[PDB]
Each structure stands twice: as structure tokens, then as C-alpha cells.
Amino acid sequence: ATVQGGIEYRMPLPDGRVGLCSVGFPVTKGTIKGFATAGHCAKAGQSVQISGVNVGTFTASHFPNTDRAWVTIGAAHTLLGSVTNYTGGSVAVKGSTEAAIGAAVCRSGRTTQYKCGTITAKNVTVNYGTLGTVSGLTRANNCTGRGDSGGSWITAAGQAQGLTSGGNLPASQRQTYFERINPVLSQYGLALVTS
Numbered sequence: 575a576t577v578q579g580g581i582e583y584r585m586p587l588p589d590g591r592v593g594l595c596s597v598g599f600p601v602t603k604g605t606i607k608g609f610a611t612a613g614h615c616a617k618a619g620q621s622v623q624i625s626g627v628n629v630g631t632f633t634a635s636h637f638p639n640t641d642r643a644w645v646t647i648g649a650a651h652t653l654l655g656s657v658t659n660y661t662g663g664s665v666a667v668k669g670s671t672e673a674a675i676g677a678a679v680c681r682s683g684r685t686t687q688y689k690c691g692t693i694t695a696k697n698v699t700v701n702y703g704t705l706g707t708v709s710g711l712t713r714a715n716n717c718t719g720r721g722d723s724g725g726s727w728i729t730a731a732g733q734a735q736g737l738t739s740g741g742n743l744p745a746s747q748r749q750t751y752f753e754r755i756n757p758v759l760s761q762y763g764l765a766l767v768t769s
């Protein structure tokens with residue numbers, strides 16, 4: 575199977591239920607293949623399917639306080655250093671220069687597909703009720719829906735920005751949040767796949 579930023583992955587849960595989330599960025603750890611995503615999506619040990627096929631398992635997850643995780647992908651699968659735009663194209667990943675407030679950014683995920691907007695605030699804390707809070711999030715006004723969680727945020731020029739932080743699917747003025755990608759890469763020791 576092919577792992578690309580923004581696409582759906584599925585998580586087999588107990589009693590035949592299935593969780594849905596979106597790929598953030600394909601990464602390598604040494605020669606290990608993987609992808610970064612949201613920690614709200616799963617805990618370590620959660621199996622992961624893409625395109626109907628077992629592709630890997632969550633390796634680490636840190637939520638709340640942060641909202642980050644990464645999945646180890648089996649060696650037989652192909653990593654694409656790009657983010658799908660859901661309409662036949664992709665944005666090639668070039669690096670992770672963090673963009674400023676006001677910068678144009680697009681996010682990709684399986685519920686609302688590819689939606690674009692601008693960054694409006696940084697270092698925001700979001701309240702998750704009984705779970706506690708997540709701090710340090712960047713806010714933007716892009717459209718988003720439940721299930722986009724974990725998916726890619728990238729500038730058109732290809733600089734990776736972050737991972738959608740938001741609600742799970744049950745199994746400026748819009749306010750949408752993402753987890754910054756550079757702290758995630760650093761914590762887990764991950765290198766972005768580029769193209």
C-alpha cells in the first residue's frame with residue numbers, strides 16, 4: 575500500500591468498530607518507515623490499515639497536553655513525500671520551515687479533503703473537558719471536520735506545518751487547530767520524507 579500525507583487510515587477497534595483518522599507526514603526513523611499523526615487518534619499498539627490492508631502499528635502517542643503520535647509502517651509499503659489534495663494532485667514535502675501568523679496554509683484529511691486558510695494565532699490552549707487540555711497549538715481559519723484529525727498542514731511551497739488537532743469520529747473567525755510538526759519530529763526522532 576501507499577502512505578501519503580492527508581489520506582485516510584482505519585483502526586480496528588473492539589467489537590467490530592473502526593476508528594478513522596488522517597495521515598500527517600510520512601517519516602523515516604533510520605530505515606524504519608512511518609508516519610506522524612495525532613495522539614488523540616490512538617495509543618501505542620493500535621493496528622493501522624490503509625487501502626484495506628494492514629500497514630502498521632502505532633509506536634508512540636502523547637495526548638493530551640500535546641497531540642502527537644507516530645505509526646511504524648511495514649517495509650513492503652511505499653512512502654510518498656507529499657500531501658494529497660484529494661483531486662489527483664499533491665504538494666511535495668520540501669522541509670519544515672514554520673510559517674508565520676497570516677501565512678497561507680492548506681490541510682488535508684479524510685472528512686473535508688483539502689481545505690485552505692491562514693494562520694491566526696500560536697501557542698493556544700484547547701480545552702478537552704474531562705481529558706484536560708492541549709497546549710501550544712497553532713490556530714487557523716481552515717475548514718475542518720471530525721476525522722480530519724492527524725492530517726497534514728502544509729504550505730503550497732511544500733513546508734510542513736503540523737497535524738490536525740481536533741475531535742474524533744464516534745465509532746479570523748473559524749477556529750481550527752494543529753500540532754506543530756517540528757516538536758513532533760524532534761520528540762520521536764523522525765525525518766520527513768521529501769520529494
Ligand code: NA
Pocket residue numbers: 638639706707708709
Ligand atoms: Na494540559
Ligand code: NA
Pocket residue numbers: 655767768769
Ligand atoms: Na524522498
